[PDB]
């Protein structure tokens, strides 16, 4: 599913992402925007290390979800990577919450540092009613 901006904003707020571990809703929106373009079925294979990024937040199979073909991988979210490809964002959100519970927080995603950190991210939630 490809979410529309405000639809996603409202969805994420209902799932309790606003202020989760000190991370504002607009930061999560900026992350989803750059990682997948708000697309839940987005997948990206990393030929260099044999891992794959899954879903709206592009969560990596080496540390967070299990896809069975990633070498030396763990499954910290205790989820099949398939769960991160559903239209229903509940599991992807639960797993994204797990990722930021680690010391790096939102910085775990390099795209956030490149395109969101220290920037005016208000535009991602403006006019959505959240």
In sequence order, the β-bridge partners of residue 20 are 23
The answer to whether the beta carbons of residues 61 and 54 sit under 8 Å apart is: yes
Active-site pick, 7, 35, 67, 91: 35
Rounded Cα gap, residues 115 and 94, in angstroms: 23
Rounded-to-integer distance, Cα 79 and Cα 116, Å = 27
7: annotated active-site residue? no
Asked if 35 is an active-site residue, the reply is yes
Selecting among 7, 49, 53, 87, the annotated active-site residue is: 53
Nearest to 69 by CA among 35, 46, 92: 46
* Determination technique used: X-ray
CATH number of 1-130: 1.10.530.10
The 10 Å Cβ neighbour count of residue 107 is 12
SS3 helix, strand, coil % of the chain, rounded to 5? 40, 10, 50
Alpha-carbon separation of residue 31 from 18, 36, 70 (angstroms): 13, 8, 24
| Sheet architecture: strand order including 51-54 | 43-46, 51-54, 59-60
User: What are the Cα distances from residue 104, in Å, to 41, 77, 92, 128?
Assistant: 26, 16, 19, 29
Instruction: Tell me the C-alpha distance between 46 and 51, whole Å.
Output: 5
């Amino acid at each position: 599913k490809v979410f529309e901006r405000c639809e996603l904003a409202r969805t994420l707020k209902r799932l309790g992402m606003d202020g989760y571990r000190g991370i504002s809703l607009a930061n999560w929106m900026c992350l989803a925007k750059w990682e997948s373009g708000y697309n839940t079925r987005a997948t990206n294979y990393n030929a260099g290390d044999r891992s794959t990024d899954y879903g709206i937040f592009q969560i990596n199979s080496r540390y967070w979800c299990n896809d069975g073909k990633t070498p030396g991988a763990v499954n910290a979210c205790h989820l099949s990577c398939s769960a991160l490809l559903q239209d229903n964002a509940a599991d992807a959100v639960a797993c994204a919450k797990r990722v930021v519970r680690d010391p790096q927080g939102i910085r775990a995603w390099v795209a956030w540092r490149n395109r969101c950190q220290n920037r005016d991210v208000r535009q991602y939630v403006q006019g959505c009613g959240v």
